[PDB]
Amino acid sequence: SNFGVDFVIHYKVPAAERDEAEAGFVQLIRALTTVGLATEVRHGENESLLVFVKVASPDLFAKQVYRARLGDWLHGVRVSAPHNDIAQALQDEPVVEAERLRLIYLMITKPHNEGGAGVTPTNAKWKHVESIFPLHSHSFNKEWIKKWSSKYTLEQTDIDNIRDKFGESVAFYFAFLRSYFRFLVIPSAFGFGAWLLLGQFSYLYALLCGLWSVVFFEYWKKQEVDLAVQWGVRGVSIQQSRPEFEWEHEAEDPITGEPVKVYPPMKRVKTQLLQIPFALACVVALGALIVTCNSLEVFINEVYSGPGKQYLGFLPTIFLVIGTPTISGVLMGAAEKLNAMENYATVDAHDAALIQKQFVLNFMTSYMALFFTAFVYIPFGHILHPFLNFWRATAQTLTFSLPTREFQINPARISNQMFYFTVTAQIVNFATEVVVPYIKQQAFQKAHEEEAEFLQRVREECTLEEYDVSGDYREMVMQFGYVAMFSVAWPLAACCFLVNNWVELRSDALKIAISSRRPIPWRTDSIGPWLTALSFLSWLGSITSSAIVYLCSPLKAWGLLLSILFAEHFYLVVQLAVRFVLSKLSPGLQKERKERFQTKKRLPEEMFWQRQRGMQETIEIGRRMIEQQ
Amino acid sequence: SNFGVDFVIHYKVPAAERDEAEAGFVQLIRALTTVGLATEVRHGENESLLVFVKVASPDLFAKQVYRARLGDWLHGVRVSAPHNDIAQALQDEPVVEAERLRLIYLMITKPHNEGGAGVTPTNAKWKHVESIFPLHSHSFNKEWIKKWSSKYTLEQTDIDNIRDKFGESVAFYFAFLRSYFRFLVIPSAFGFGAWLLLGQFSYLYALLCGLWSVVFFEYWKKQEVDLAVQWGVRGVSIQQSRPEFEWEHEAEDPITGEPVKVYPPMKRVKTQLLQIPFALACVVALGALIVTCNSLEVFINEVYSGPGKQYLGFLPTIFLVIGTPTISGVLMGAAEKLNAMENYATVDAHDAALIQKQFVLNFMTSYMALFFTAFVYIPFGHILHPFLNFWRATAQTLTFSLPTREFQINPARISNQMFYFTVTAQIVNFATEVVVPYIKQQAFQKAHEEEAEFLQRVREECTLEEYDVSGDYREMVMQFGYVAMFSVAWPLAACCFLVNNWVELRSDALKIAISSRRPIPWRTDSIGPWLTALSFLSWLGSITSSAIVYLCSPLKAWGLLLSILFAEHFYLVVQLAVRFVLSKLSPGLQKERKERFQTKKRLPEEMFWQRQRGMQETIEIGRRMIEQQ
Ligand SMILES: [Ca+2]
Ligand SMILES: [Ca+2]
Ligand SMILES: [Ca+2]
Ligand SMILES: [Ca+2]
């Protein structure tokens, strides 16, 4: 059990600049004391100095919590008006752990004018402060793992508990994974049905796959809106600006009427418009390598008859493994250099821009081999003839002293590639994610009274790295892209993916439990830029499915064009119909509208009109007029 | 000048059922007296009985106006909170004429439980009440016409005055017409440039026309939102239900917490799903006639050599004129019968459904001849061979006693048709709209003291019909469809349209001034279903332009398919970019958010933490720890 410790600061001290390190330590202690948090100090690993900080006075902390809740309600991020006095607001809803931890973290690091102290390491006057991290709970982790590992389905209460404990981002990711796993069932069902009844490359399968993709996307959007409203986060616009921000001037904010720094959006749009040449450059760089190694593989495997073919067959795999990391790193460095000068105000926008910049690289790294195999190899077996000859010539130049074989296309290559990507890639990915990092950490670790165990545990936790949710989102997005794009060439893929997803729904949890330290609980409204990635992947799959089903079934061009047209237009019509049907039917919006309603409700001219100046006289004159007529 | 009269009721009395008519008259007088409005009675045309009604007590009317304003603010249709007491709300903003007239009309006709009396003629117990209409003002009409006829451009003040006087629907229509006229300038500019420099059937012209169409649509949507917020109408949801409504049960409204009748939306969607067979049936019915008369015209004009060709050349025009009205009437009756059982709650939804049902008929009536000429005649001159032979055979059967000529396609047919539709159709439409109805009314008209002139004027106004804004909207939509669809075949069209639009911007006003009586001032939020019509017309034109430019320039199919693909994808990309750019940049939303913001703001555990219980001691022990290290 934790010893009442709220936050821990590492504060590594190098051997050199000892006076500067001591000055930083005393300044940090002074700042934390003047903020109003109780602090201690203990030993580090070998040169650091671990310190523990916690809240001292519960009453002032409760007052600050109430003020933060009032501000959040005032800014419009929640729909429940708090009580006027602090007598039941903290009793009707207890202060959850995540909210208290987030408030403490915001107190620790913020500008001195409004917050407590700018203890952020990126200030350039606060160095040697390596990281600030909270502490894990062993009993809760064990109970959560045991409960989750022995249940066939997960109700909303588990996701609510995850939101209460670990914040909103992890809960959103787990809810998205649960929804994806639940919606992946129908894919598997009718894919297995088609594989049993029909054959390979079926048009109906592609059409129904597009329909399922659009239906799932719309339903997930609606459920995401509902969940965002339920948890009381909406447009979380209120975040503080990044320290590295450049502004031309300061004006008056039209909403709050406060002086804020203003940067025109036209300059930002003009800077953003330059992304296209970067995309083209990375596209060319990745293609010129992937195609080359793939062609080398086709040469080595297909057209060759010399001994020792098995030994030489591993050349392109190690070539890719050695080569693609450095190209990816150079391109990522260029993308970071580009994004640094974009002048993004909020940190979340900066992270979204970085994710969008990386997405193209991950997309091609995942799909270029399949695209080359399915669009260049199977339909046209003669376009690759000179490239092969090229390689053959080099073989002669390599030999300096060779038999060959007539080239014939093998239709089973795509099935083997899809089977590999569906089974072996998933198995290797799970092994790398779970087993090896724990073994590495344990091997690295192997090589006062009543508190030595706690100190050892906190040191071990400080040794570990920080957990990130971007990787899991990227993996799930790539899996969905595979399903939406290339499932028409091997219908049994989805079923296998389903099984993997189930294991992931627990495996990722284990990754949080033991192999990483608890992240800082942040608040987010949506999953982020992944919605656009999902939409683009679905749209591109809607075309690629029909292109593959026509080009891999003398291949008239007009037939392929007509198939692409029909598939795309059917996808658009289905999307419109699904959107209309869903819009015709959300408790969250109704609740917000009702709350707003309740809040609002809580607060010849004169003589003409004199002739018949009565009731009986008018009726009498009307009767006389009727009788005269 | 009006004699203080607010509203006029006709109350025609037939010769038969005199006792029933008298009973209705006395009941109506009693109801209007018990509501609280001063009423008179005068002579009619020959058997009717005109009555005048006005508000009696200004104080109670002002109180009702304030209550209505408070209710409107409470329901969320306006963003300005009224004053607590009636001392400056009626002084800061004077009660406009349109609002007072609308409130009086709502008082006159409404259910007796909440309103004054159900004087609506569609109640089946209130007959012989032909119509309730307000009175025009001659001085204001003359001044408005004189001011508008002598200004090159119109500022927002004129539209604001129109909104103040004639309500919101007419003001919205005039604002839309002004925006369309202003945005039609660039069309004319580069169309004239292309006609001077390039030749006919240019691809760049079609691409830029699509770009202009999407840009104009997005800008109009933004301006419409801004104008709707400015005038204090938003989601005008608050309208009373139609008397002819069928409900399964009554439940609690989630918003206002009041008992309202509930009809499930799934049944309505299922009923709406049957529209497709009706559309197909009307499509076939219109095509089977238009194609037949067009083919007869081609026979008579092209392949014939007998005398008296000019006399026989007018056969298909009179054939269309005689034939299409009855088909249109039958189809409209069927559509009305279908829409009556749709069970639409609000009257505006019913009108929108009727407009959407009619739109297909007007669309094909306008565009079928051009489609047949541009897609069947010019590219393939041999598909029409047997149809011609068919007609020729009948000629023999007609002769019962003939020379012919070899059939050759004339490329100038499309230019002549477009020139006709651009010049002669507009001239004839303007003449029919303006000149003939006034002459007909004057010819029909030709064949107590100090008030005879007013009685004659009111009788003449009662003679006229009711003004409707649907026709002008339909005409403008069809004009925009022509511009977006078939301008690539004759670039000089847009310029001519521009001139016509200018005249219309005054001509329609004249139509309101003299040829029609003032409509009941209603409130609307948007133009209605015309947004979907504009979007569909633009999307279809984006394809039709490229199809025409490729098929009318040995016509390989793959080239046409590729052209269609490229044009549609370019249109989609341009639409996405324009939407993003516009969203990156609206004062109305900012004002509403600021108003909402202001409204919201108006309201080993114990001993571990004891070892260093201070500030100086912590620093001293930290220094000792550092020294020991
Ligand atoms: Ca995995
Ligand atoms: Ca994962
Ligand atoms: Ca006209
Ligand atoms: Ca008009």
UniProtKB/TrEMBL annotation, chains A, B:
One of its GO terms (molecular function) is chloride channel activity. The keyword Nucleotidyltransferase does not apply. It comes from the Eukaryota. Ca(2+) 3 binds at residues 433, 472, 504. Ca(2+) 2 binds at residues 433, 472, 475, 504, 508. Keywords: Calcium, Membrane, Metal-binding, Transmembrane, Transmembrane helix. Its main location: membrane. Residues 4-129 form the Anoctamin alpha-beta plait domain. This is Plasma membrane channel protein. It comes from Fusarium vanettenii (strain ATCC MYA-4622 / CBS 123669 / FGSC 9596 / NRRL 45880 / 77-13-4) (Fusarium solani subsp. pisi).
